[PDB]
Amino acid sequence: PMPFISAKSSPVIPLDGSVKIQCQAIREAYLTQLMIIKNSTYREIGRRLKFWNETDPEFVIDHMDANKAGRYQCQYRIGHYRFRYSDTLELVVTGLYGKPFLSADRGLVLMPGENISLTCSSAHIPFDRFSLAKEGELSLPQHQSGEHPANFSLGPVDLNVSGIYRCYGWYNRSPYLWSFPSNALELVVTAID
Ligand SMILES: *[C@H]1O[C@H](CO)[C@@H](O[C@@H]2O[C@H](CO)[C@@H](O)[C@H](O)[C@H]2NC(C)=O)[C@H](O)[C@H]1NC(C)=O
Numbered sequence: 355p356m357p358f359i360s361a362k363s364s365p366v367i368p369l370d371g372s373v374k375i376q377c378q379a380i381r382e383a384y385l386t387q388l389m390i391i392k393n394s395t396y397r398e399i400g401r402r403l404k405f406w407n408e409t410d411p412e413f414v415i416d417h418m419d420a421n422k423a424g425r426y427q428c429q430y431r432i433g434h435y436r437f438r439y440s441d442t443l444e445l446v447v448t449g450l451y452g453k454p455f456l457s458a459d460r461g462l463v464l465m466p467g468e469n470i471s472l473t474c475s476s477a478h479i480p481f482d483r484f485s486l487a488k489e490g491e492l493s494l495p496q497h498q499s500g501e502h503p504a505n506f507s508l509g510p511v512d513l514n515v516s517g518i519y520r521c522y523g524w525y526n527r528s529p530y531l532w533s534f535p536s537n538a539l540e541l542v543v544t545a546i547d
Pocket residue numbers: 459471505506507
């Protein structure tokens with residue numbers, strides 16, 4: 355098990371936003387610094403916070419841009435020149451490409467168990483892949499699709515599927531750089547009808 359590396363704010367940060375990262379404390383570390391990976395090379399980044407309301411080291415990265423998007427790890431210097439790292443965290447920056455369009459082939463309100471797929475298009479920008487995000491959620495959108503027609507299925511829906519959804523740009527060359535959110539699309543599952 356590797357030291358955890360959570361993100362207090364969403365891992366999805368708008369163009370010039372700012373995010374707060376937290377690493378797992380390691381009693382034997384003389385120094386702990388947030389590192390960002392770039393071409394198999396660890397680079398110092400972000401800023402350390404002060405001791406209060408929490409123990410595990412917290413950092414903060416502001417003025418988000420392409421350069422700050424990507425994989426992150428925590429570097430624990432457990433000696434003059436001996437280190438160990440936390441698990442990996444990914445941060446994506448949004449607002450680098452025009453917004454795509456999200457829609458559905460059904461009715462936005464539906465009985466549980468029903469099936470529905472959301473489609474995310476882009477009649478201009480040849481996005482390599484697409485990612486669907488559920489607004490409320492505190493994390494990183496993992497539900498993606500490479501299909502050009504862009505199909506996001508949700509199999510048998512349950513009351514938990516309800517909520518507002520948005521879709522993003524996304525390019526293979528530059529994976530951690532997404533477009534501006536697409537139009538939002540609300541769904542509501544209810545067994546009452
Ligand atoms: C994307 O989702 C699945 C493919 O993974 C397709 O599902 C079929 O959808 C048609 C009409 O929408 C239904 O008649 C079939 O019963 C579905 N079968 C499956 C695979 O579950 C879906 O069509 C695709 N998106 C669309 C509508 O183009």
